[PDB]
């Protein structure tokens, strides 16, 4: 019996990563962000909050290589979670956090919104794969790796995606972004106007209903001044913009 609403932040309240919004910077690395965010969450869930770490977007973005795609010029979720199963991922927090083994090297920026940071730009290079932790971090790069037991596609089924989240925690998904999506502030996003911009990868962490509209609860990787504090809701139940068609997840190995 699935509940009418579910929010992973409410189910697993000693897992702060689920609460967190990252900033992919001037880099098309959302494929990597949705993966390491959901993986961070699932490690904390899998251990009852005994292990709570920011998994390194840098390590996945820079060290996966051609298996995952083309780094900052785009990649795909399914191979991101496969990489976690094969080579694992070290820890790493936000730009200049000094959190973990490999904190993200690309500065934060303004994503389709006004604020104090520089506006995000295109054409950024993928940073180099560096298999060493920031000076003074313990343990070693190799010792800090977290591995996946498995990786898998979730079927294009609303109730299967809900059950997956409900049992195992947040997932990665991808959908088609039309230009009206860029100006999202609140409520349940449905495509009403604008042309296709491209595919986008995100973290799905729950569901609900607002004013009779069923939705998914989704985290973007565009900082907290984008959207609804960095989150959005998107129409659920109709494979809207492909939101149910590209869902990926995986079960962590106990460290
Ligand atoms: C994942 O990284 N997705 C990127 C492309 C999406 C395609 C559909 C339009 C929305 C974006 C993305 O999120 N890009 C970021 C960062 C960026 C900014 C400017 C130039 C290149 C990359 C974005 O904020 O759009």
Residue numbers in the entry: 0 to 254
From the publication, what sentences describe this entry?
Cathepsin B shows endopeptidase and exopeptidase activity, an uncommon dual functionality among the cathepsins. A special structural feature, the occluding loop, covers the primed binding region in the closed conformation of the enzyme and confers a dipeptidyl carboxypeptidase activity to cathepsin B. The two protonated histidine residues (His110 and His111) of the occluding loop interact with the C‐terminal carboxylate of exopeptidase substrates, and of epoxide‐ or nitrile‐based inhibitors. In this study, we developed peptidomimetics with an inversely oriented warhead that undergoes deprotonation by the active‐site thiolate as the key step for the covalent inactivation of the cysteine protease cathepsin B. Cathepsin B has been validated as an effective cancer and inflammatory biomarker and a promising drug target.
With Pro in P2′ position, Leu in P1′ was slightly more advantageous than Cha (8 versus 12), but Phe in P2′ gave a better combination with Cha than with Leu in P1′ (7 versus 4). The most suitable dipeptide sequences were disclosed as Cha‐Phe, Chg‐Phe, and Cha‐Pip (7, 6, and 13). Two representatives were subjected to crystallization and the crystal structures of human cathepsin B in complex with the type A carbamate 7 and the optimized inhibitor 31 were determined at a resolution of 1.45 Å and 1.70 Å, respectively. Noteworthy, since 7 and 31 contain the same carbamoylating substructure, the complexes are highly similar with an RMSD of 0.12 and 0.09 Å for alignment of inhibitor atoms and protein Cα atoms, respectively. Hence, the different N‐terminal substructures influenced the non‐covalent binding event, but not the accommodation of the covalently attached dipeptide portion. The latter is held in place through a network of hydrogen bonds and hydrophobic interactions mainly with the side chains of Val176, Leu181, Met196, His199, Trp221, and His110, His111, which compose the S1′ and S2′ subsites, respectively. The N‐terminal CO‐NH segment is hydrogen bonded to all three residues involved in catalysis, including Cys29 and Gln23 (in S1) and His199 (in S1′). The imidazole nitrogens of His110 and His111 interact with the properly positioned carboxylate, similarly as in case of CA‐030. Our inhibitors with inversely oriented warheads behave as suicide substrates, undergo cleavage and effectuate the fixation of their dipeptide portion in the primed binding region of the protease.
